[PDB]
Design a binder for this molecule. Structure first.
Ligand SMILES: *[C@@H]1O[C@H](CO)[C@@H](O[C@@H]2O[C@H](CO)[C@@H](O)[C@H](O)[C@H]2NC(C)=O)[C@H](O)[C@H]1NC(C)=O
Ligand code: CU
Ligand code: CU
Ligand code: CU
Ligand code: CU
Length: 495
């Protein structure tokens, strides 16, 4: 179901049983996943979020992030609690009013308070391009070609310990899947295709943690979009997609009419596909209504490798073709010990006053912004390079930056940098010990922008910092509506 660009979005509690185990959830728009929020590039989104949550066990306060949307001019609408807003309290609503100039592609939205999106507040967000340069590559692109991959837990997110290796209890594809342990034969999702059509499949990781090895028995996939950036066609037979990443891929429905397994193996939790875990069904029209009996290739012979991706446009790479070839080059020291993560020696703990309101109330430098040591100021109109060397306890961490996308100058498991034509994206695996995954972008967007590992349990254990981009121009760049200003006194009064 698709809603928007102007829409109500109610946040409710419900019990659901997507793997056959009933448990409480926090839902957007009443469904899991939430409804697809959609519009065309350049359209004004007005999402009126009604908080109606009553179940404390999962927090009755909420805040929603439109993941990958740059929010230029609207930093107050970005969503991370205590970075850009205080949460909306139960009984109140809040109108997320923003534009998406320049952006088209496949995105998603999710709670951005504590670990609440794990408890179910996650949904797809698609910005359609009426002149998409990839349109001639397929026949079908609509709500039925969206595929979400979700980890699902039988423990309430607020009770996960924390951390604490945490592992999921079931992989859901389009909201359905089977439990890893004592697997019950509950219904699987079906994706239906017709012989000879081509499909723009929009593959969205709404994961709180695991990365997935996604494949479709007997079929190939040609990638045309990465995290909202159009890419040159890259045909693969397997895609490893980390938390929060998105790909569009053309599925040519060119096999005999029949049932084929769709596979999504998480890097932790249940291994393999016994009893149909980690599975959905690709069904051709005409096929018998029965489970697939297909098998994966024994060896996947063309798996996605991030360095094989290239932008469709001529994006290039800001700055100069060598490391440190930037105006403000940084190399973050990413650590873990004693159950907390750290960036440059400091574990992130949300401050009482949101970063944005600290700035609007007259804070001027990172030194003046709380939490101390969790904010790095960035100057305006400068090429930023950030090196994110891996090694920190497990691993592999998908780092994500708000308000921007970035050139992936160096990828995982490959020490060679690329200053000509790397893919740009917004969430990137930093790989393994010895890797030096490096990103570059330009500061053309004033505001406080969160940078963190998108494994939500790692974010709650402190793996984050805020890039305060152009403090001096932040207030003037981001006029806030009074409803925004009303957020924090309501929150602090209720709490
Ligand atoms: C490691 O990463 C580099 C950088 O993207 C890759 O190097 C490119 O390789 C292709 C050939 O496959 C050449 O056409 C380009 O000239 C290379 N670009 C640069 C900047 O060197 C390399 O392929 C990657 N290694 C593996 C094993 O995938
Ligand atoms: Cu996100
Ligand atoms: Cu984001
Ligand atoms: Cu992490
Ligand atoms: Cu975030």
């Amino acid at each position: 179901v698709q809603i928007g660009p102007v829409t109500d979005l109610h946040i409710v509690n419900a019990d659901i049983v997507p793997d056959g185990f009933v448990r409480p959830a926090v839902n957007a728009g009443g469904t899991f996943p939430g409804p697809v929020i959609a519009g065309n590039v350049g359209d004004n989104f007005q999402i009126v979020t009604f908080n109606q949550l009553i179940e404390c066990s999962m927090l009755v306060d909420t805040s929603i992030h439109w993941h990958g949307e740059f929010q230029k001019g609207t930093n107050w609408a970005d969503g991370p609690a205590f970075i850009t807003q205080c949460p909306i309290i139960v009984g109140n609503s809040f109108s997320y009013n923003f534009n998406v100039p320049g952006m088209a592609g496949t995105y998603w939205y999710h709670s951005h308070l504590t670990t609440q999106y794990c408890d179910g507040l996650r949904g797809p967000f698609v910005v359609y391009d009426p002149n998409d340069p990839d349109a001639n590559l397929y026949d079908v692109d609509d709500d039925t070609t969206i595929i979400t991959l979700a980890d699902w837990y039988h423990v309430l997110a607020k009770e996960m310990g924390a951390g604490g290796a945490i592992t999921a209890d079931s992989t859901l594809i389009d909201g359905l899947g089977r439990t890893h342990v004592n697997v019950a034969a509950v219904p699987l999702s079906v994706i239906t295709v017709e012989v000879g059509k081509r499909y723009r499949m929009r593959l969205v990781s709404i994961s709180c943690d695991p990365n997935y090895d996604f494949s479709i028995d007997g079929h190939d996939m040609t990638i045309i979009e990465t995290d909202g950036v159009d890419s040159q066609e890259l045909t693969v037979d397997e895609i490893q997609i980390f938390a929060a990443q998105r790909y569009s891929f053309v599925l040519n429905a060119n096999q005999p009419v029949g049932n084929y397994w769709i596979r999504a193996n998480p890097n932790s939790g249940g291994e393999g596909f016994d009893g149909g875990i980690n599975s959905a069904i690709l069904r051709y029209d005409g096929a018998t209504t029965a489970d697939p009996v297909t098998v994966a290739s024994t060896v996947h012979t063309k798996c996605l490798i991030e360095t094989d991706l290239h932008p469709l446009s001529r994006n290039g790479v800001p700055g100069n073709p060598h490391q440190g070839g930037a105006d403000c080059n940084l190399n973050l020291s990413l650590g873990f010990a004693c159950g907390n993560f750290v960036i440059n020696g400091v574990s992130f703990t949300p401050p009482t006053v949101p970063v944005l309101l600290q700035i609007c109330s007259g804070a001027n430098t990172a030194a003046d912004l709380l939490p101390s040591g969790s904010v790095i100021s960035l100057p305006s109109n400068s090429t930023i390079e950030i090196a994110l060397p891996a090694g920190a306890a497990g691993g592999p961490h998908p780092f994500h930056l708000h308000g921007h996308d970035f050139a992936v100058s160096e990828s995982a498991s490959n020490s060679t940098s690329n200053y000509d034509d790397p893919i740009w994206r917004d969430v990137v695996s930093i790989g393994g010990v010895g890797d030096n995954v490096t990103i570059r972008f330009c500061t053309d967007n004033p505001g406080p922008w969160f940078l963190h590992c998108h494994i939500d349990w790692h974010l709650d254990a402190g793996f984050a910092i805020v890039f305060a981009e152009d403090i001096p121009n932040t207030a003037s760049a981001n006029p806030v509506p009074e409803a925004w200003s009303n957020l924090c006194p309501s929150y602090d009064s209720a709490h």
